[PDB]
Design a protein around this ligand. Structure first.
Ligand code: ZN
Lengths: 55, 309, 135, 288
């Protein structure tokens, strides 16, 4: 996930709080991955799933 | 017949032991066939050891120029690698073990001794050479097996050698390829010395029902991730070493051929050169098949996983 | 006058403890030494335990937080040490582990300290729990 | 019926490849010595920690058939017991093993004598004449049940596992590498792709089970099994994986490298064939 997509889809203005939200999610065992700041990318290795509307 | 080798013919063994063909040729024994069971037991014991040398006895038989190892068992001895004939301290134990083994249908007798060289290759040191010389003075048909459990793990390939000593005063003939081993500074000095001193026995082995049970069970689960990457050959130590040995062998073949062009009428030189070229070609070929099979498995699996749908 | 090894150990231990409370342990380094030099001669286990506690305290003071935590952890799984002192020594191990240099050795100690149930009783239980669980 | 119904395993049994290795060797030699596949009997040793039983090694026992009853030489077993003491102390006796199909009215007789020796023996039976792809090894325990008012000992199947260490793993992996070759080389790539075929078959069976469960849930069953179907759908959403330019570049790099190696090997084989052809031609018509 590039940092440009993160700042767009989440109404994220300051990149500093973006990092704080990303680390907060990881440390609560939500997403496992690695952050690439030189290329401004978020490499996620593992993440939890989501729900289904039976469709 | 896969199981034919498991048949024990006592009279035939007695006939071979009475004939003693090894007294007619010091290079008589050329091949060493090892069962799955024996090898597995040896490796397990050596790895339990960890960094200390252990040793044991091998049970088996002889068949022409081939020494056959059917089973093995650990000896409760101190001073492996420091004491000449350390096995001697277990004499009583060996007698009882074998006696009890005969009671349960183990018919094969002592064929050799095995010991470990954790992290320093597979060779015979001055002590090992003295021990195996004595083991070939009273029990002439004895094979010394050396295993490196540490290098087995690090290389992902079994590190085992089978060796036989030359009698005191006797000099080896011209041939001696001697695959180089990465033994430590002084250990490698002594290793060159004793590779010049003894002769290795071509590892032959035999695929059997023991092997069939092992290969099947471990691959099913210990290789649920049949991935384990796919290339444990990535380490540029084994394939690179084979490549360098190939280059040296063919360079020596060319050096011999260039000098042999001046002498007109030397058939033996032509024979030897052709044989050396052929051996080099087959070695390179087998390396190539190994690499191709590795890439094939890699391609099939990674294509399937990454882009199934 | 051959002072019994315990007496020399007791005297040298007292000097080190006095210097620790005064914090000029350039000499207490040389005094925990001469305590150690004759340490492997003595008999009294309680004196040996009292030595290892003081020796761990010396390690904690200078820079050896990682080594003091190791010494405190070794002293934590004892029996003659008072349960309150055992909890205190482990609490000293936990604080030293957190304060030590963040590395491979410190990570292993954090894993080891995540096993004691009396670590959980401590107030800093949360601190290493966030720590070793990568927060 | 010697099998208990409705009885679940009370202890966990860990088995090592060496134990299966000893059983296979024992059965083969007895078959070779006495024609038909004569039943073998041995003993199990290892470490037990509470309810966790780990069978690390096994050995053979001397038995005699008297009055159509298998009498185990417990004196030999005890003589061999102290014999294994001299080499290993940490290994304790755990049970006995045999070969055959379903339990017969002779293994109960063997087990009751072994139950006389120690507090709780484990019973293992291997089937060397199996035909399915599953492991023909089962572990049974001793249970006392009141059948027709009489206490009859029965066998309850235990859900044992297959525990092994890094050593044994690497060792048998290279034993399989060595079986990939041999003196009588029939084929090599055949065995390789048969191994991959078996792996893909196992994964396909798992996928079939998952799909059948999903279809049943769509029809009946639990309408939503919660975290299970959630994770199954998530994994089906991670099926595309999605590679980047770098991963494809590295894959093509490895392919090109090892393909160049294959080309070099083919060149070596071709030049050896050319050398043989030249050597033969220099004898066919040429002189000197
Ligand atoms: Zn040696």
């Amino acid at each position: 996930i590039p940092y440009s997509v993160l700042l767009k889809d989440l109404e994220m203005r300051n990149l500093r709080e973006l990092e704080d939200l990303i680390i907060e999610a990881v440390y609560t065992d939500i997403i496992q991955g690695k952050l690439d700041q030189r290329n401004q990318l978020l490499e996620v290795d593992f993440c939890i799933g989501r729900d289904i509307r039976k469709k | 017949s896969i199981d034919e080798i498991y048949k024990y013919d006592k009279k035939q063994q007695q006939e071979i032991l009475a004939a003693k063909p090894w007294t007619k040729d010091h290079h008589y024994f050329k091949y060493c066939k090892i069962s799955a069971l024996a090898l597995l037991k040896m490796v397990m014991h050596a790895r339990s050891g960890g960094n200390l040398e252990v040793m044991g006895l091998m049970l088996g038989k002889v068949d022409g120029e081939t020494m056959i190892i059917m089973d093995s068992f650990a000896l409760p001895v101190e001073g492996t690698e420091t004491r000449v004939n350390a096995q001697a301290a277990a004499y009583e134990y060996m007698a009882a073990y074998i006696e009890n083994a005969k009671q349960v249908g183990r018919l094969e007798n002592a064929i050799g001794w095995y010991h470990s060289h954790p992290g320093y290759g597979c060779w015979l040191s001055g002590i090992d050479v003295s021990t195996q010389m004595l083991n070939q003075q009273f029990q002439e048909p004895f094979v010394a097996v050396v295993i490196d459990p540490t290098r087995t793990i690090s290389a992902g390939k079994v590190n085992l050698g089978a060796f036989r000593t030359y009698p005191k005063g006797y000099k080896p003939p011209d041939e001696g390829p001697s695959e180089y081993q990465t033994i430590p500074l002084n250990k490698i000095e002594d290793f060159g010395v004793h590779c010049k001193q003894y002769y290795a026995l071509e590892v032959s082995y035999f695929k059997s029902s023991l092997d069939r049970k092992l290969l099947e069970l471990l691959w099913n689960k210990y290789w649920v991730n049949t991935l384990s990457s796919s290339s444990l050959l990535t380490n540029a130590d084994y394939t690179t070493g084979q490549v360098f040995d190939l280059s040296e062998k063919l360079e020596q073949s060319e050096a011999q051929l260039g000098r042999g062009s001046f002498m007109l009428g030397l058939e033996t030189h032509d024979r030897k050169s052709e044989d050396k070229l052929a051996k080099a070609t087959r070695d390179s070929c087998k390396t190539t098949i190994e690499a191709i099979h590795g890439l094939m498995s890699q391609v099939i699996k990674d294509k399937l996983f990454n882009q199934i749908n | 006058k051959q002072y019994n090894v315990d007496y020399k150990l007791e005297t040298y231990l007292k000097i080190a403890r006095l210097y620790l409370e005064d914090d000029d342990p350039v000499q207490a380094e040389a005094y925990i030494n001469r305590a150690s030099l004759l340490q492997n001669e003595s008999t009294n286990e309680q004196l040996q335990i009292h030595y290892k506690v003081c020796y761990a305290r010396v390690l904690d003071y200078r820079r050896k937080f990682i080594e003091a935590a190791q010494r405190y952890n070794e002293l934590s799984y004892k029996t003659i040490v008072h349960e309150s002192e055992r909890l205190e020594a482990l609490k000293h191990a936990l604080h030293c582990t957190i304060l030590a240099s963040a590395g491979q050795q410190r990570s292993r100690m954090l894993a080891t300290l995540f096993k004691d149930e009396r670590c959980q009783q401590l107030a800093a239980y949360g601190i290493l729990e966030k720590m070793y669980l990568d927060r | 019926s010697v099998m208990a119904c409705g009885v679940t395993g009370s202890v966990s049994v860990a088995l090592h490849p060496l134990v299966i290795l000893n059983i296979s060797d024992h059965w083969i030699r007895m078959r070779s010595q006495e024609g038909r596949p004569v039943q073998v009997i041995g003993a199990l040793i290892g470490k037990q920690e509470g309810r966790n039983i780990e069978v690390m090694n096994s050995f053979e026992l001397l038995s005699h058939t008297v009055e159509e009853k298998i009498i185990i030489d417990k004196e030999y077993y005890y003589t061999k017991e102290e014999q294994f003491k001299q080499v290993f102390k940490e290994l304790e006796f755990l049970g006995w093993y045999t070969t055959g199909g379903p339990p017969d009215p002779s293994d109960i007789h063997v087990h009751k004598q072994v139950c006389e020796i120690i507090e709780s023996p484990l019973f293992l039976k291997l089937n060397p004449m199996t035909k399915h792809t599953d492991l023909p090894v089962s572990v049974f325990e001793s249970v006392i049940d009141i059948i027709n008012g009489e206490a009859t000992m029965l066998f309850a199947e235990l859900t044992y596992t297959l525990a092994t260490e890094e050593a044994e793993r690497i060792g048998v992996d290279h034993v399989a590498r060595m079986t990939a070759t041999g003196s009588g080389e029939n084929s090599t790539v055949a065995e390789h792709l048969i191994a991959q075929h078996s792996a893909i078959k196992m994964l396909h069976s798992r996928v079939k089970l998952i799909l059948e469960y999903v279809k049943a849930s769509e029809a009946g069953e639990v309408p939503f099994n919660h975290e299970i179907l959630r994770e199954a759908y998530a994994l089906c959403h991670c099926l595309p994986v999605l590679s980047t330019d770098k991963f494809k570049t590295d894959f093509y790099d490895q392919c090109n490298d090892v393909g160049l190696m294959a080309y070099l090997g083919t060149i070596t084989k071709t030049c050896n064939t050319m050398n043989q052809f030249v050597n033969k031609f220099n004898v066919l018509y040429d002189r000197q």
